[PDB]
Amino acid sequence: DPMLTQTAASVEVAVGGTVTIKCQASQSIGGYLSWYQQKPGQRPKLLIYRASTLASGVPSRFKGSGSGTEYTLTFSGVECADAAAYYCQQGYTSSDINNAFGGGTEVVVK
Amino acid sequence: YLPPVPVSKVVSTDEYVARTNIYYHAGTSRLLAVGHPYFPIKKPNNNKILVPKVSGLQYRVFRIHLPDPNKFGFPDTSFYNPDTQRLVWACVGVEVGRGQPLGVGISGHPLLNKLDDTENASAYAANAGVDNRECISMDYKQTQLCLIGCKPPIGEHWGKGSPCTNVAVNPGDCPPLELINTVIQDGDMVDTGFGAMDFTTLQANKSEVPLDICTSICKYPDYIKMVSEPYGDSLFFYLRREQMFVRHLFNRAGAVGENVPDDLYIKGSGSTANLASSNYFPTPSGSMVTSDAQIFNKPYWLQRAQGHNNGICWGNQLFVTVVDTTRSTNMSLCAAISTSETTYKNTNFKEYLRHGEEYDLQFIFQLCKITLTADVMTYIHSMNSTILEDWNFGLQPPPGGTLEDTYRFVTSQAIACQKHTPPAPKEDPLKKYTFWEVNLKEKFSADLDQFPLGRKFLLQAGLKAKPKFTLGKR
Secondary structure, X not given: OOOEOOOOOOOOOOOOOEEEEEEEEOOOOOOOEEEEEEOOOOOOEEEEEOOOEEOOOOOOOEOOXXXXXXXXXXXXXXXXXXXXXXXXXXXXXXXOOOOOOOOOOOOOOO | OOOOOOOOOOOOHHHOOOOOOOEEEEEOOOEEEEEEOOOOOEOOOOOOEOOOEOOOOOOOEEEEEOOOOOOOOOOOOOOOOOOOEEEEEEEEEEEEEOOOOOOOOOEOOOOOOOOOEXXXXXXXXXXXXXXXXXXXOEOOOOEEEEEEEOOOOEEEEEOOOOOOOOOOOOOOOOOOOOEEEEEOOOOOEEOOOOOOEOOOOOOOOOOOOOHHHOOOOEEEEOOOHHHHOOOOOOOOOOOOEEOOOEEEEEOOOOOOOOOXXXXXXXXXXXXXXXOOOOOOOEEXXXXXXXXXXXXXXXXXXXXXXXXXXXXXXXXXXXXXXXXXXXOOOOEXXXXXXXXXXXXXXXXXXXXXXXXXEEEEEEEXXXXXXXXXXXXXXXXXXXXXXXXXXXXXXXXXXXXXXXXXXXXXXXXOOXXXXXXXXXXXXXXXXXHXXXXXXXXXXXXXXXXXXXXXXXHHHHHHOOOOOOOOOOOOOO
16 A cells, blocks of 8 residues: 655745645655645646646646655745645555545645 | 697688498487477476477477497498597488478467557547456467587577666666577577567566467577687578568557657647557468478488588587477367266366477488597697597596496495485586487488488489399399
8 A cells, every 4th residue: 555644734934935845655656646736715726747747727836856755846936826735646546545645735825 | 749830720621521431320210299388287386397388389409319439330341440540420411300280370368468459540548447458369470490500509589687877767767688699498489570588587567478478588599690600510501481471550558658759749639638659569470381382301411511510510419400380280179077968068168278299300420530640639629628528538547446336226224325416527518408308329220221211312312233233133
């Protein structure tokens, strides 16, 4: 069972700060990993997959890195509509796992 | 005391071996081989081989042990001093034969990595089932060869080696794929289809080709290494033959690492913003295997080698390899667990598969004596050390003793442990590499009139007074 913990509550950040959210995995998953933003009133919404390739309609000010077992997600220039919930998620599609790919939050930006 | 200078270049054998009129015939009896065509079957608990793998794609290297002609019997007017000259065998005619019907030999294993076909379609579906691989079977490519050398032949394959320690980013990387060449065993396979890569130390999914070449190496002979060596050894009469054809066009799983560039296609929209596949394996098929071009049961002879040495067989040894996949029949066998039921069933008869092969070899050898006066003695020892070491030219050590006590009852509690417990060489170095032994120690025959090849060689050359006029017409 590949497990990503994400036991990290996010720190208060101002406009223009940089945040390092770190998602670590027990088993090696390759590069297959996704990230999502969850605004607390609507459906979830994806930013980047395979830790390097961003989706359409998303600005290039979000970053992606990390390989092997640990991965990250950084960005700078925090707007007003970045108050949401974040989630890292693997794609190893195994059978005997109980993933839920959980963890991740983000404070209201001052 | 100051030996003369040795010649810096090598030389053909016409200058220092002699040729007499004394010929001999040696033909083995019959050689049969039965087993399974796909995998050598074994017990579920441990390693033990009930049936051998036998399929018609192997190499079948032979190893001919010849009788030593330094103690051998001859008719009259053949004389030599054993302190001055010695004797050696030379082959002048060889045959390879098979009696079988004429087969095909298809294969295919039930877990072959296929996704779709790329010959026609209407709409491509990105599917990616977990192991969605399916049984597909195929044909192979027909090949023939014959190589005759004093030492075993040499093949090649494309494998994997250690890269430079510059960059290490992922276990999902690519090997360097350097080229190496080894000595050929009895059981290595050939395919001129997918080609010479060992599918074990290179492919970890082991689901690329059918299962007859999946746990082993698919080799291929060189034809450059065995002619560029300065002696003319290891092959001196080769006859190559093969055919090929392409049948169908398919796709692998599709986990591409070497991605496509961007500036090659144009991006569309909707379902047209993805990739179908980039990796295509085609299937081979040998076609129209007609038995008029078969290079077999035809007694060819030798007057000239492609190399420097002729069919002089140093060390009283000879190697023959033949490759055939035209007799590749398969025998659908089945047997029933119970016969009393007057209705046929699912599981009352269970089936098997077997494969067989029949060989026969016949040779014509010619006597060759070699005089030695202080000049070729320097040359022969420099050619190979074992050629001079198989004949004793040095006198005795100071203790000779009675060679080995030779106890009578070899398994008891009286004596200590005996019989070759420390094995000092004197053996063949190639003991670690298996062959097919063919013992021909007393197969030879001085007359060759009543022999099935012997009149075919005799008819070709002059037969005038050689046959003799046994009891006459009037």
